Amino acid sequence: SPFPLTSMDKAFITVLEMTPVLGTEIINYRDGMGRVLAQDVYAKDNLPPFPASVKDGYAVRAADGPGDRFIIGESQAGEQPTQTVMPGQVMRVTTGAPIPCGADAVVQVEDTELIRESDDGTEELEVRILVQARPGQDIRPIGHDIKRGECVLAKGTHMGPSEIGLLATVGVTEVEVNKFPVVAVMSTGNELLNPEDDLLPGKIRDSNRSTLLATIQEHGYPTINLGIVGDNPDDLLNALNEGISRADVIITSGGVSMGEKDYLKQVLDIDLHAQIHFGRVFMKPGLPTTFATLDIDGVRKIIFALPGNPVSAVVTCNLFVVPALRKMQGILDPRPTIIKARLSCDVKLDPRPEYHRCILTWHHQEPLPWAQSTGNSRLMSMRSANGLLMLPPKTEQYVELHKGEVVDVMVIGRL
Ligand SMILES: [Ca+2]
Incomplete structure (x- = not known):
């Protein structure tokens, strides 16, 4: 000194x-916000784990082509179907429902017309398939989104909501993170x-x-x-x-x-x-x-x-x-x-690099935000600083900066 x-x-x-x-320490996934993974995370199941319908409609044999079909029943989300679809048959499906044995494609309800119901009108009996399904159409096959054994999150990942959701998806509810x-x-x-x-x-x-x-x-x-x-x-x-x-x-x-x-x-x-x-x-x-x-x-x-x-x-x-x-x-x-912003006000520069709290505002269709130094409008006065203006040290040529000029602003707040 x-x-x-x-x-x-x-x-x-x-x-x-x-x-x-x-x-590092192990935490519950729900406490992961802002944490960094200190481990790789792997899937132990396929997503979907069963071939899944993308649409509400009908599981079909594409080979049957267009035409009139008997509806043998319905595959519902949450339940494994037990029937097999034989040629000239279809099964009703909803979004997320497993595709039954014997179907190889899905036709959405909009490409069909209902023929027969049950007097109760509880049961669709027969449906006209108005299109030639492409094979595998509107089906998410096993493992389409995530495969068993796939590394879904890498060590070093800084976690936000979607990462917490992915941990939930793969059932990895406890993870090693930095303290x-x-x-x-x-x-x-x-x-x-x-x-x-x-x-x-x-x-x-x-x-x-x-x-x-x-x-x-x-x-x-x-x-x-x-x-x-x-x-x-x-x-x-x-x-x-x-x-x-x-x-x-x-x-x-x-x-x-x-x-x-x-x-x-x-x-x-x-x-x-x-x-x-x-x-x-x-x-x-x-x-x-x-x-x-x-x-x-x-x-x-x-x-x-x-x-x-x-x-x-x-x-x-x-x-x-x-x-x-x-x-x-x-x-x-x-x-x-650090982002670029336009100065809202003339400033004279110091020999020292200088820093000042400011408010960043993005205007209608202007590409860069305006940086307004705090401490000089009420509507703005009700806004907490969200940037730190980073002013360059004075040099012989540059002794001031003018409103409009592009400057570095460090982000310190939301938005
Ligand atoms: Ca003192």
């Missing part, structure tokens, strides 16, 4: 490189009160802990609220040790300026014996951001000490923390999605 000013790219790479992938990181969050500073407290002289309410916890929670990960910790080395060590014991990841905010009353980086190094990989970043906001690892009992814990400024803390959490958590839970490429 002063720690060297680390370049943004180097800082980001270092976080991903130094972050570990967590161990989710448990994330512990503290705030430090003698000025901070809880959100629940009325103000006292010289104090303000801690908003970072809430905003950071909600951010991590939005991504699906379990959290621990370590509370407010004062500006003093002894209490910081205790809190940090508690965090280490209870979590995979610790996030702090405040206590990382160069000033006094700022001991956190010192505690990380000497007291905790952590390795600090960077202690400042050439970025705006986020200058004092610090990243450390701690290897204890063959397990690596990671520690992010973010700036106390509330805006810096959310921005740095999105840039550095979220990707790391994605790596820890097994996502193979944990990097954020």
